[PDB]
Design a binder for these strands. Structure first.
Ligand SMILES: [Ca+2]
Ligand SMILES: [Ca+2]
Ligand SMILES: [Ca+2]
Ligand SMILES: [Ca+2]
Ligand SMILES: [Ca+2]
Length: 754
DNA sequence: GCGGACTGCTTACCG
DNA sequence: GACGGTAAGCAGTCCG
């Protein structure tokens, strides 16, 4: 299985490296054959040799075009003949391009911004992580003596924990007398040992939880300060800390550095992303957190380093268990997209789509359109109409049937051949015209994107069939990950059209998708209301809730099933409506906010404060208990009482602190903010202490007693101590518990609760 | 003047 | 880190 690709420079010539593992042995295949290239559309082929003599200096010396060949290749379907300009070293590409482009003979420079290592994987048609081979993995974690506002790295590492299938152990230089602790003599000697342990085990994968930003960077700062050759690589390389986007990312050449944080963040939706939370979330089993204040006084005292140790050991043990559960699906991802597990792990669905197209485009002889310049993105800053959301018939309704379209936007993208290479073509035999946008899509050639979208959905059914046949539970799991991933990639294509920084951007494509969406949703609703006697209670894009007021639950079911038989033949192409659920009773509050309870008794909650992370857990609990009473039981008085007891408990100061924590994410650099919410006021005072309040950072806080602006009275949950502080018993009753509860119980017009 | 009515910023959800 | 549509709360500024 091809792990990843890289290139070194042997005697001033770029030699490619394909890191593979064949028959339970890591092998490195070199390739000097592959020469870099980039395309160029000259105004007149006559000016080939004239424009071929452009140059500019690199670090070593001057760079000039090695050779050039005029090539025929399709662009948005339309045939085009352009010059591909070969260069000796890939780092000559970024030097020559700007000047070669400015040349008043060439029209534009194309396909110049693809890395060579990634170019090789595409052009050769080599698929990463293909074939059956069990890869050895080692999870590791570090514990540091980082002070309050201490310059990053000055604090020394106290312990290094590593864990795999066999064992979990701690290496440290203070004396923790336990069977899983290895006492070294100095910090230097423990790092020396850790590096040796990694060398001895020689694992294919190194698992971390946010190792990209903290763990690896910190080990470097120390290895510099102490003077240790930080060689974790298989080729004897020190780990490469690249500045990928807002954050950084770290590559251990020869191994897979699998940072769980970015993957877990993308996958799971949690209030906070502590390794304690991620564990308790995924596995359900709890994990205690030995703090920095504790880890410090432990080291300073010597008393009770056994807890500080157990923590470090459990951190690695958990990291391993999380890694072994997440890695497999992130591997099948690598296969589907066709780039390394490393990239696919740290990539947006936005870029995963573009990588998947760049690959298919090469195979189709399609020249890839360039990413937009700064002036272009400004021109793509024009929004478009979304989908229909019906203003809901409010109240408690009985016997609701949920109907929705199966893969709506994809069905449209396929059916109407929606693609930039088909948008308003010249003299096609057949066209499909968008309802209100008016955009006409050529229906002669199967479009680039639709063609691929078909194959994906076409393969997903092949995989779901092979799953039925699969006897091995492991393969049936790995097969489910593939089929599942295909779907999520298939539903990303509408979004990619609207995404400005996308190569294959198309505003009129995205506009037309939503438009057809609006028409078909509205047309279904109209029929179910007219032809059949249903009353559409609420509807969002692609889905609706309805019932037959006064009819029995059985009748609602039968009649809804009868409607699907009627409507589907009337609908065109792949546009098909499906019966998705029936619910005993349901409650619609506002647009995007409602709840329903199924026949078995499982309540389903959408949009209400219960699900939101930026509400006090007392408000989210108090609501869920009121909502349970109204739906599950039916005791409206019980809800009235549930509010009052909870309300009195807070005013008596008997409400636990833990339940009062409010979580609000920091969107941008705190300076850029135009108006200060509490979370901003919390973030700005925390940053004044030299803390790292950066984009992605979730701010926890509690409202302290008093009056005025809520933001000037917010002490972080960690910072908060009971003392004589207490809490703003008013706020949590006035602004949190009551408003949220009121939303549900307002249907029966309740005024005030004690 | 004062304080109730408006309005823009920001967050997190829904599909 | 895709998309647009939506409900809110909090902290400012009108204007009768
Ligand atoms: Ca020009
Ligand atoms: Ca539903
Ligand atoms: Ca099904
Ligand atoms: Ca019941
Ligand atoms: Ca948006």
């Amino acid at each position: 299985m091809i792990l990843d690709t890289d290139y070194i420079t042997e005697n001033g010539k770029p030699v490619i490296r394909v890191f593979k593992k064949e028959n339970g042995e890591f092998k490195i295949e070199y390739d000097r054959t592959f020469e870099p290239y980039f395309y160029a559309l000259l105004k007149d082929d006559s000016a080939i040799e004239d424009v071929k003599k452009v140059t500019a200096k690199r670090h070593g010396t001057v760079v000039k075009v090695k050779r050039a060949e005029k090539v025929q290749k399709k662009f948005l379907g339309r045939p085009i003949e352009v010059w591909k300009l070969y260069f000796n070293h890939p780092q000559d590409v970024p030097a020559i391009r700007d000047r070669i482009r400015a040349h008043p003979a060439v029209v534009d420079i194309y396909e110049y911004d693809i890395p060579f290592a990634k170019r090789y994987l595409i052009d050769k048609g080599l698929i990463p992580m293909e074939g059956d081979e069990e890869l050895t993995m080692l999870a590791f974690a570090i514990a540091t003596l980082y002070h309050e506002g201490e310059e990053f790295g000055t604090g020394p590492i106290l312990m290094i924990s590593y864990a795999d299938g066999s064992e979990a152990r701690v290496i440290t230089w203070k004396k923790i007398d336990l069977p899983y602790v290895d006492v070294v003599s100095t910090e230097k000697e423990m790092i020396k040992r850790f590096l040796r342990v990694v060398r001895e085990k020689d694992p294919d994968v190194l698992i971390t939880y946010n190792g990209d930003n903290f763990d690896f960077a910190y080990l470097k700062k120390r290895c510099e300060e102490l003077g240790i050759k930080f060689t974790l690589g298989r080729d004897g390389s020190e780990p490469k800390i690249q500045r990928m986007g807002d954050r950084f990312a770290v590559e251990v050449k020869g191994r897979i550095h699998f940072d769980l944080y970015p993957v877990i963040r993308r996958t799971i939706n949690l209030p906070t992303y502590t390794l304690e939370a991620v564990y308790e979330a995924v596995f359900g089993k709890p994990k205690e957190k030995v703090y920095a204040e504790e880890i410090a006084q432990a080291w300073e005292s010597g008393e009770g380093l056994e807890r500080v140790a157990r923590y470090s050991m459990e951190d690695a043990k958990v990291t391993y268990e999380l890694g072994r559960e997440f890695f497999p699906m992130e591997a099948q991802l690598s296969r589907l997209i066709g780039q390394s597990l490393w990239d696919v792990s740290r990539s947006s669905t936005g870029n995963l789509v573009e990588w998947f197209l760049l690959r298919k485009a090469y195979k189709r002889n399609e020249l890839a359109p360039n990413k937009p310049d700064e002036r272009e993105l400004a021109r793509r800053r024009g929004g478009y109409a979304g989908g229909y959301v019906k203003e809901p018939e409010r109240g408690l309704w009985d016997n609701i049937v949920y109907l929705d379209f199966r893969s709506l936007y994809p069905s449209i993208i396929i059916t109407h051949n929606v693609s930039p290479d088909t948008l308003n073509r010249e003299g096609c035999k057949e066209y499909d015209v968008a309802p209100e946008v008016g955009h006409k899509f050529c229906k002669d050639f199967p479009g680039f994107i639709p063609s691929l979208l078909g194959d994906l959905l076409e393969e997903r059914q092949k995989i779901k069939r092979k799953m039925k046949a699969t006897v091995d539970p492991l393969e049936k799991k790995l097969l489910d990950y593939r089929q599942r991933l295909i779907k999520i990639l298939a539903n990303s294509f509408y979004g990619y059209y609207g995404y400005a920084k996308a190569r294959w951007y198309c505003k009129e494509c995205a506009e037309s998708v939503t438009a057809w969406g609006r028409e078909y949703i509205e047309m279904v609703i109209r029929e179910l209301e007219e032809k059949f006697g249903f009353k559409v209670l609420y509807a969002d894009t692609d889905g609706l809730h309805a019932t037959i007021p006064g009819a029995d639950a059985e009748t609602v079911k039968k009649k809804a099933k009868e409607f699907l038989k009627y409507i589907n033949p009337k609908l065109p192409g792949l546009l098909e409506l499906e019966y998705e659920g029936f619910y005993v009773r349901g409650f619609f509050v506002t647009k995007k906010k409602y709840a329903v309870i199924d026949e078995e008794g499982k309540i389903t909650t959408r949009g209400l404060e219960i699900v939101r992370r930026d509400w006090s857990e007392i408000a989210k609990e108090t609501q869920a208990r009121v909502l349970e009473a109204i739906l599950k039981h039916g005791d409206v008085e019980e809800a009235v009482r549930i509010v009052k007891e909870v309300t009195e408990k807070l005013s008596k100061y008997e409400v636990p602190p833990e339940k009062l924590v409010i979580h609000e994410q920091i969107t941008r650099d705190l300076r850029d903010y135009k108006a200060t919410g509490p979370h901003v006021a919390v973030a700005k005072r925390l940053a004044a202490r030299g803390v790292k309040i950066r984009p992605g950072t979730v701010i926890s806080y509690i409202v302290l007693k008093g009056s005025g602006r809520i933001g000037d009275r917010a002490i972080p949950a960690d910072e908060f101590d009971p003392t004589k502080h207490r809490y703003d018993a008013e706020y949590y009753i006035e602004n949190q518990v009551l408003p949220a509860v009121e939303r549900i119980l307002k249907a029966f017009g309740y005024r005030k609760e004690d």
